[PDB]
């Protein structure tokens, strides 16, 4: 009935236009507190985020799902501050990404489940803020630990109704492996979003997962190093496929009849310490619209390509509400 | 003239009997704040630490150097709380151990230097507490990143006068490689302590480093899985050499004339999340004296073996004061 946000619970109808895979900051556990100057200052980072969120709001965005986990250096207090200042709802996450420290890496599936349940039911750290989604990741074949992470995520999802969203090496078809693990735990595909899906041109892989009930996250739309092939680091991160090429996969999926399974986002950020120094500068040059990229550029583009405005609204409003709403299996 | 502690600066003479390589808690960045229940509770951990520190104080210990770095999940506020409650001085550290997250791993030697300088000159996080030692580590041949870490540590040491202490895979003679890097940066051996040195039976390796001016840290004295060969995990961590065997290396070094280069400790802890679950229980069974092990057991043992009480006092009081005192090279 309600979705947990960093400012408290909201009703489903209050979500409105939602970006399902974003980040205020891409960092590491403890980093922001230990070396804020890496980002100018904590203040500068917050202001930058507020400005970006306000521009996105101007464009129609009401809610963003920040999928930063503990290992992504998620700072809920920062999230709460920025949500209040920008007047944009922000859903926080639990789960683990691909940079877990030893204290996490050595845990059993049972312990990991407890930790995820903690963040969802009790609250994150001592803030009382509860997570509204579980984030997991693989980058090719799952490691044995990654397998434990996926099982624990499925278990926490099963107990709480909270959805699961993932990071994948799409080109390697990681989605297939994740699905298999989740299913083995009895999790329903409809509670799972297979992210970074636009990173691949293989529609056969995407339609196959969609046919099974999975949500497909087309969240790297503005990710492109075209014009910067000069830059190896940027190139390795963003790829050389155009934003138009990525956006067209959205239309392809709709054309195949999977409009109800699609989730779109930018996978944007305002700070990024987990990569080469100065990567943010490069990114901001590439996509000055930041998180407003989807509503300002993608939507109109799709409309122009023949996608009905109504369909577009269902993808940006309806689908997310259905996904985000905590749902227990019968 | 003064040494920085978690409660502020103290004069050299206020240090007294000091344990140079200890930890209040062995964890990971952000862990303690995110999952305190892993340790019962934050409160339970603090009480346990206070009780342990008070017993150590009863035995004569005045100061402990907590060598937990950011990646060891160092929580200075915890350190400050416990120092106040137990009335034991605690010196905090900067540096990096062997579990750095991506945000650290991707940094240049120049950036790393800035971060260490920050913690030493400005303060840790927003606490205003300044580090009094720089901790570094290798576990066999240094990785390229570990090499950057050692150079940055040497640079921060050179600028501030603060000593450097290390973690080594003694059996692999890591000390040799560390020394070479430090020397290449122009750091004086007398500002460096090569730790976990009692982990090896090779006196030739130890006397060689001592001859060069390095301080030798014999800090794993009570580390022993004898009686627990049954337990693979404990065995891999503690080894099967007796505490007596380790303690005798202290006497061997004194006999060779290196009394002024020796530093002794327990490498103890009150909480430990970076290993198998329940490892603390095993450890507490092995050494119920915890940090009081050195004064209660080792000292008398050495005395019995013919080491003059005066020599022992110089090792536990004098050597540490000389090491800890910030010293700029001429
Ligand atoms: C916060 C996540 O960073 P990535 O997953 O993608 C960046 C937008 O890869 C970073 C190493
Ligand atoms: C806090 C450090 O832990 P270790 O270096 O030695 C434990 C006393 O190795 C732990 C993996
Ligand atoms: O109110 C703006 C939300 C929205 C804008 C454009 C297309 C679909 C949904
Ligand atoms: O006051 C006790 C300090 C100390 C105790 C025993 C041997 C050397 C030093
Ligand atoms: Zn991702
Ligand atoms: Zn992401
Ligand atoms: Zn160590
Ligand atoms: Zn240690």
């Amino acid at each position: 009935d309600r979705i947990n946000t960093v400012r408290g619970p909201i009703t489903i109808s209050e979500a409105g236009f939602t970006l399902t895979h974003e980040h205020i900051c891409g960092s590491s556990a403890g980093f922001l507190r230990a070396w804020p100057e890496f980002f100018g200052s904590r203040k500068a980072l917050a202001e930058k985020a507020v400005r970006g969120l306000r521009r996105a709001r101007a464009a129609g965005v009401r809610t963003i799902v920040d999928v930063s986990t503990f290992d992504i250096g998620r700072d809920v207090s920062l999230l709460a501050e920025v949500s209040r200042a920008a007047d944009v709802h922000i859903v926080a996450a639990t789960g683990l990404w691909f940079d877990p420290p030893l204290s996490m890496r050595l845990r059993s599936v049972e312990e990991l489940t407890q930790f995820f349940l903690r963040e969802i039911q009790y609250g994150i750290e001592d803030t009382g803020i509860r997570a509204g989604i579980i984030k997991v990741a693989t980058t090719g074949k799952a490691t044995p630990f990654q397998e434990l992470v996926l099982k624990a995520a499925a278990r926490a999802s099963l107990a709480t109704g909270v959805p699961v969203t993932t990071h994948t090496a799409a080109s390697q078809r990681d989605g297939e492996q994740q699905a298999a693990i989740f299913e083995s735990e009895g999790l329903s595909p409809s509670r799972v979003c297979i992210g970074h899906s636009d990173d691949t041109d293989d529609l056969s892989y995407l339609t196959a997962l969609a046919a099974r009930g999975y949500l497909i996250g087309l969240d790297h739309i503005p990710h492109s190093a075209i014009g910067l092939e000069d830059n190896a680091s940027a190139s390795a991160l963003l790829g050389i496929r155009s934003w138009q090429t990525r956006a067209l996969l959205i239309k392809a999926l709709i054309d195949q009849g999977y409009m109800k399974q699609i989730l779109v986002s930018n996978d944007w950020l305002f700070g990024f310490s987990s990569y080469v120094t100065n990567i943010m500068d490069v990114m901001d040059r590439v996509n000055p619209d930041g998180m407003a990229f989807i509503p300002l550029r993608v939507i109109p583009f799709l409309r122009e390509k023949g996608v009905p405005q109504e369909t577009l609204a269902g993808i940006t409003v309806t689908n997310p509400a259905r996904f985000l709403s905590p749902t227990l299996r019968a």
Side-chain angles (χ1 to χ4, degrees), chain A residues 21 23 97-98 135 167-168 196 220 267:
Chain A
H21 186 125
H23 301 276
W97 179 70
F98 55 78
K135 166 72 176 295
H167 170 109
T168 64
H196 304 337
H220 268 180
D267 193 27

PDB file of all heavy atoms in Angstrom, chain A residues 21 23 97-98 135 167-168 196 220 267, ligand 5:
ATOM      1  N   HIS A  21      16.663   3.441 -11.551  1.00  0.00           N
ATOM      2  CA  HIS A  21      18.038   3.036 -11.308  1.00  0.00           C
ATOM      3  C   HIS A  21      18.919   4.266 -11.387  1.00  0.00           C
ATOM      4  O   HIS A  21      19.340   4.663 -12.474  1.00  0.00           O
ATOM      5  CB  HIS A  21      18.552   1.922 -12.266  1.00  0.00           C
ATOM      6  CG  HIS A  21      19.943   1.400 -11.927  1.00  0.00           C
ATOM      7  ND1 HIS A  21      20.193   0.051 -11.723  1.00  0.00           N
ATOM      8  CD2 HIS A  21      21.134   2.059 -11.751  1.00  0.00           C
ATOM      9  CE1 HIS A  21      21.495  -0.086 -11.425  1.00  0.00           C
ATOM     10  NE2 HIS A  21      22.104   1.107 -11.436  1.00  0.00           N
ATOM     11  N   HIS A  23      21.704   7.057  -8.798  1.00  0.00           N
ATOM     12  CA  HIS A  23      22.567   7.148  -7.632  1.00  0.00           C
ATOM     13  C   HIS A  23      22.815   8.600  -7.326  1.00  0.00           C
ATOM     14  O   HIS A  23      22.963   9.400  -8.245  1.00  0.00           O
ATOM     15  CB  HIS A  23      23.984   6.613  -7.922  1.00  0.00           C
ATOM     16  CG  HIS A  23      24.033   5.172  -8.362  1.00  0.00           C
ATOM     17  ND1 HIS A  23      24.043   4.120  -7.426  1.00  0.00           N
ATOM     18  CD2 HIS A  23      24.062   4.641  -9.627  1.00  0.00           C
ATOM     19  CE1 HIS A  23      24.086   2.992  -8.152  1.00  0.00           C
ATOM     20  NE2 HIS A  23      24.103   3.263  -9.471  1.00  0.00           N
ATOM     21  N   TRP A  97      26.703  -4.877  -3.874  1.00  0.00           N
ATOM     22  CA  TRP A  97      27.178  -4.687  -5.249  1.00  0.00           C
ATOM     23  C   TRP A  97      28.448  -5.488  -5.453  1.00  0.00           C
ATOM     24  O   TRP A  97      28.608  -6.526  -4.820  1.00  0.00           O
ATOM     25  CB  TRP A  97      27.331  -3.188  -5.511  1.00  0.00           C
ATOM     26  CG  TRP A  97      27.818  -2.628  -6.823  1.00  0.00           C
ATOM     27  CD1 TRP A  97      27.191  -2.603  -8.030  1.00  0.00           C
ATOM     28  CD2 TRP A  97      29.017  -1.879  -6.975  1.00  0.00           C
ATOM     29  NE1 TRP A  97      27.935  -1.896  -8.937  1.00  0.00           N
ATOM     30  CE2 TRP A  97      29.071  -1.447  -8.320  1.00  0.00           C
ATOM     31  CE3 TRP A  97      30.051  -1.537  -6.075  1.00  0.00           C
ATOM     32  CZ2 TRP A  97      30.145  -0.681  -8.792  1.00  0.00           C
ATOM     33  CZ3 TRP A  97      31.107  -0.780  -6.543  1.00  0.00           C
ATOM     34  CH2 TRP A  97      31.146  -0.363  -7.886  1.00  0.00           C
ATOM     35  N   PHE A  98      29.372  -5.062  -6.301  1.00  0.00           N
ATOM     36  CA  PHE A  98      30.534  -5.912  -6.448  1.00  0.00           C
ATOM     37  C   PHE A  98      31.829  -5.538  -5.740  1.00  0.00           C
ATOM     38  O   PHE A  98      32.895  -5.979  -6.126  1.00  0.00           O
ATOM     39  CB  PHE A  98      30.739  -6.351  -7.915  1.00  0.00           C
ATOM     40  CG  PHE A  98      30.813  -5.192  -8.881  1.00  0.00           C
ATOM     41  CD1 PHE A  98      31.992  -4.455  -8.967  1.00  0.00           C
ATOM     42  CD2 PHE A  98      29.752  -4.854  -9.727  1.00  0.00           C
ATOM     43  CE1 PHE A  98      32.104  -3.384  -9.856  1.00  0.00           C
ATOM     44  CE2 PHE A  98      29.848  -3.791 -10.625  1.00  0.00           C
ATOM     45  CZ  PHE A  98      31.029  -3.053 -10.683  1.00  0.00           C
ATOM     46  N   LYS A 135      19.285  -4.497  -4.026  1.00  0.00           N
ATOM     47  CA  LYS A 135      20.154  -4.436  -5.174  1.00  0.00           C
ATOM     48  C   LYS A 135      21.242  -5.514  -5.117  1.00  0.00           C
ATOM     49  O   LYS A 135      21.879  -5.713  -4.077  1.00  0.00           O
ATOM     50  CB  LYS A 135      20.767  -3.028  -5.260  1.00  0.00           C
ATOM     51  CG  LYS A 135      21.954  -2.940  -6.230  1.00  0.00           C
ATOM     52  CD  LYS A 135      21.514  -3.018  -7.690  1.00  0.00           C
ATOM     53  CE  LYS A 135      22.675  -2.835  -8.650  1.00  0.00           C
ATOM     54  NZ  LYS A 135      23.247  -1.485  -8.551  1.00  0.00           N
ATOM     55  N   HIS A 167      22.381  -5.600 -11.355  1.00  0.00           N
ATOM     56  CA  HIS A 167      23.407  -5.066 -12.207  1.00  0.00           C
ATOM     57  C   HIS A 167      23.850  -6.299 -13.014  1.00  0.00           C
ATOM     58  O   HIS A 167      24.028  -7.362 -12.440  1.00  0.00           O
ATOM     59  CB  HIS A 167      24.623  -4.558 -11.407  1.00  0.00           C
ATOM     60  CG  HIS A 167      25.830  -4.206 -12.262  1.00  0.00           C
ATOM     61  ND1 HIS A 167      26.247  -2.877 -12.458  1.00  0.00           N
ATOM     62  CD2 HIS A 167      26.686  -5.023 -12.948  1.00  0.00           C
ATOM     63  CE1 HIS A 167      27.322  -2.919 -13.245  1.00  0.00           C
ATOM     64  NE2 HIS A 167      27.607  -4.195 -13.549  1.00  0.00           N
ATOM     65  N   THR A 168      24.036  -6.181 -14.329  1.00  0.00           N
ATOM     66  CA  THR A 168      24.482  -7.318 -15.122  1.00  0.00           C
ATOM     67  C   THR A 168      25.519  -6.860 -16.146  1.00  0.00           C
ATOM     68  O   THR A 168      25.631  -5.665 -16.433  1.00  0.00           O
ATOM     69  CB  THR A 168      23.344  -7.891 -16.045  1.00  0.00           C
ATOM     70  OG1 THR A 168      22.911  -6.953 -17.023  1.00  0.00           O
ATOM     71  CG2 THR A 168      22.160  -8.440 -15.292  1.00  0.00           C
ATOM     72  N   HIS A 196      20.779  -2.852 -16.682  1.00  0.00           N
ATOM     73  CA  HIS A 196      21.816  -2.584 -17.672  1.00  0.00           C
ATOM     74  C   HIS A 196      21.535  -3.384 -18.931  1.00  0.00           C
ATOM     75  O   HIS A 196      22.426  -3.706 -19.679  1.00  0.00           O
ATOM     76  CB  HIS A 196      23.204  -2.919 -17.107  1.00  0.00           C
ATOM     77  CG  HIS A 196      23.421  -2.145 -15.853  1.00  0.00           C
ATOM     78  ND1 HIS A 196      22.717  -0.978 -15.595  1.00  0.00           N
ATOM     79  CD2 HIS A 196      24.237  -2.368 -14.813  1.00  0.00           C
ATOM     80  CE1 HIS A 196      23.118  -0.512 -14.419  1.00  0.00           C
ATOM     81  NE2 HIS A 196      24.030  -1.332 -13.901  1.00  0.00           N
ATOM     82  N   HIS A 220      20.780   2.542 -19.200  1.00  0.00           N
ATOM     83  CA  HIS A 220      22.061   3.138 -19.550  1.00  0.00           C
ATOM     84  C   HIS A 220      21.921   4.001 -20.784  1.00  0.00           C
ATOM     85  O   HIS A 220      22.887   4.261 -21.471  1.00  0.00           O
ATOM     86  CB  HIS A 220      23.051   2.007 -19.873  1.00  0.00           C
ATOM     87  CG  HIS A 220      23.801   1.634 -18.643  1.00  0.00           C
ATOM     88  ND1 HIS A 220      24.769   0.634 -18.634  1.00  0.00           N
ATOM     89  CD2 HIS A 220      23.724   2.154 -17.383  1.00  0.00           C
ATOM     90  CE1 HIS A 220      25.257   0.569 -17.390  1.00  0.00           C
ATOM     91  NE2 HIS A 220      24.650   1.472 -16.611  1.00  0.00           N
ATOM     92  N   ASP A 267      20.920   5.738 -14.775  1.00  0.00           N
ATOM     93  CA  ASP A 267      22.085   5.236 -14.076  1.00  0.00           C
ATOM     94  C   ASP A 267      23.058   6.402 -13.934  1.00  0.00           C
ATOM     95  O   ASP A 267      24.273   6.277 -14.139  1.00  0.00           O
ATOM     96  CB  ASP A 267      22.731   3.970 -14.696  1.00  0.00           C
ATOM     97  CG  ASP A 267      23.743   3.274 -13.793  1.00  0.00           C
ATOM     98  OD1 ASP A 267      23.586   3.422 -12.497  1.00  0.00           O
ATOM     99  OD2 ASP A 267      24.642   2.602 -14.226  1.00  0.00           O
TER     100      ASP A 267
HETATM  101 ZN1  LIG C   5      25.291  -1.087 -12.240  1.00  0.00          ZN
END
